[PDB]
Amino acid sequence: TQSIIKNDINKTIIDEEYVNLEPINQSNISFTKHSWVQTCGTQQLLTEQNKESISLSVVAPRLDDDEKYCFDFNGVSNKGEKYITKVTLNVVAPSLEVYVDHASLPTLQQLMDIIKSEEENPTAQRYIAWGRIVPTDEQMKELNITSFALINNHTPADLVQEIVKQAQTKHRLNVKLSSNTAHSFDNLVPILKELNSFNNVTVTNIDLYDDGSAEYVNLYNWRDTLNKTDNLKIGKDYLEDVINGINEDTSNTGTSSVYNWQKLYPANYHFLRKDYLTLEPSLHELRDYIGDSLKQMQWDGFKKFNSKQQELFLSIVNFDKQKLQNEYNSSNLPNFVFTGTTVWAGNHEREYYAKQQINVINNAINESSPHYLGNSYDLFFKGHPGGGIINTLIMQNYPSMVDIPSKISFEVLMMTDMLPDAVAGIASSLYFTIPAEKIKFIVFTSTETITDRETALRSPLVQVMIKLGIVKEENVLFWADLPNCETGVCIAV
Ligand SMILES: OC[C@H]1O[C@@H](O[C@H]2[C@H](O)[C@@H](O)[C@@H](O)O[C@@H]2CO)[C@H](O)[C@@H](O)[C@H]1O
Ligand SMILES: Nc1ccn([C@@H]2O[C@H](COP(=O)(O)O)[C@@H](O)[C@H]2O)c(=O)n1
Ligand SMILES: [Mg+2]
Ligand SMILES: [Mg+2]
Numbered sequence: 001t002q003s004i005i006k007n008d009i010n011k012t013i014i015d016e017e018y019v020n021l022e023p024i025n026q027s028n029i030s031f032t033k034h035s036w037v038q039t040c041g042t043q044q045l046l047t048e049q050n051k052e053s054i055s056l057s058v059v060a061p062r063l064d065d066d067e068k069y070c071f072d073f074n075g076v077s078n079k080g081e082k083y084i085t086k087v088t089l090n091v092v093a094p095s096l097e098v099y100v101d102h103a104s105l106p107t108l109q110q111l112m113d114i115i116k117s118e119e120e121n122p123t124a125q126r127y128i129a130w131g132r133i134v135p136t137d138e139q140m141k142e143l144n145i146t147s148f149a150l151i152n153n154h155t156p157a158d159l160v161q162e163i164v165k166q167a168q169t170k171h172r173l174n175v176k177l178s179s180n181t182a183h184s185f186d187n188l189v190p191i192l193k194e195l196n197s198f199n200n201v202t203v204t205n206i207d208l209y210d211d212g213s214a215e216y217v218n219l220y221n222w223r224d225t226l227n228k229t230d231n232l233k234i235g236k237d238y239l240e241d242v243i244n245g246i247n248e249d250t251s252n253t254g255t256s257s258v259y260n261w262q263k264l265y266p267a268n269y270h271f272l273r274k275d276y277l278t279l280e281p282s283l284h285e286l287r288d289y290i291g292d293s294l295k296q297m298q299w300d301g302f303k304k305f306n307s308k309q310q311e312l313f314l315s316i317v318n319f320d321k322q323k324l325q326n327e328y329n330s331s332n333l334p335n336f337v338f339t340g341t342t343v344w345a346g347n348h349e350r351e352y353y354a355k356q357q358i359n360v361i362n363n364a365i366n367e368s369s370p371h372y373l374g375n376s377y378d379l380f381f382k383g384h385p386g387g388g389i390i391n392t393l394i395m396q397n398y399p400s401m402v403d404i405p406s407k408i409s410f411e412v413l414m415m416t417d418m419l420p421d422a423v424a425g426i427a428s429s430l431y432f433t434i435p436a437e438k439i440k441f442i443v444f445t446s447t448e449t450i451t452d453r454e455t456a457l458r459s460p461l462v463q464v465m466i467k468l469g470i471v472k473e474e475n476v477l478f479w480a481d482l483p484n485c486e487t488g489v490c491i492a493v
């Protein structure tokens, strides 16, 4: 007439999911009549004793294609008021998203993918095996994450088993996979060779995010390859045979294997610096070969998040922005962030690494050095995520210094517009991305041996970083190379 009390419920809902929904929000509320009626949808879901309870109880059907189902509730209260509520169930394929990385860069990008996906795909389940970010149980619950411990930095057996159980248990399954690029082969292969025999599972996408500079060193060496295209095609058959189980030798985990995902699956390569495949003429073949799966890693994920998403993100990466802003604020002096490094597979080297980085910081803040920033600065430190005892040694050398928790990827400071006035430090993937104008100087690693300059410049990382226009050859600095500031006066070598 219409004093009929209307309500509308909309839900999404995977195959075989149980649903129990209250039609009304008036309390009690007590009904004389009602009726439940399936009103759209092809499979019949209302089983007669369903209809007789006031809350709606149904099991989503097994489907081949997503489909909407409709149910109309009508009631007359004892009062005797009329109610009508229209219910829509969007039934969608069960889906899985798997993300694996032991490093920093890929894990950061995967995090941003998860947060976006929690909005776009609420019913997706998410499995992570991460080394350097650990969400709380609350955060996991909020993002539908189950977590798994990396073994030898790679996909663990228990992650694979859990994926197998989903394949066995879900009637159709969409899977997305995401990995560290350099380490794809050991992260994804054990998963893909299980899933390969499951006809109900569709691998809809594989995302590859660069470890960082590591893949560029590899590509720099791989420039030498004769018959690149031949090697890559042999790469496809090899990878194909390994996943099919036809070939048992799972040993060629490197370059010619890692750039074939797109030949076997829908896949996207998110390059830290896509332009490297163009800047190096000899890699044009590889650029051709990756074709329209070649993407540039994006840094607008944070900006594109809504404000709740931005908070959840900062909270998961443990960045307290307001606290850093306070610290910036605070002193008259402009702010300087020194970015540190770590040694992989060289624990015997890390005290030497600490002592050298202390010397690099000293060069920046000591007037008796040509690398002097030019003014007094408040001193800030970032911490290599894997720096461990290197970070504590550097930290206790400076009373004085403010940490930037080392676990925070530096690019989140870029994305949050929390870059200081000056940044300098050790050669790192972070310099592949940070705007040139912020960089005061970059310093490359030296061993206790060389110290010779000509062949020091030969180092792949140096040649990458030159080619990318990050640094100019005539200005490359090596630790050793730099004046010794340890006594308080900077003395030339
Ligand atoms: O950029 C990350 C590099 O990690 C190296 O692995 C380290 C690992 O990160 C650390 O947590 C511990 O397990 O020591 C490992 C030994 O090197 C990889 O070896 C390297 O390839 C990079 O991915
Ligand atoms: N001082 C540093 C060094 C590295 N990192 C993080 O680790 C990633 C890989 O850096 P490296 O090339 O130094 O290993 C960087 O992109 C950045 O996310 C950092 O946040 N702070
Ligand atoms: Mg990690
Ligand atoms: Mg070239």
Ligand SMILES: [Mg+2]
Residues within 6 Å of the ligand: 327, 328, 329, 330, 331, 332, 333, 334, 335, 378
């Ligand atoms: Mg200040």
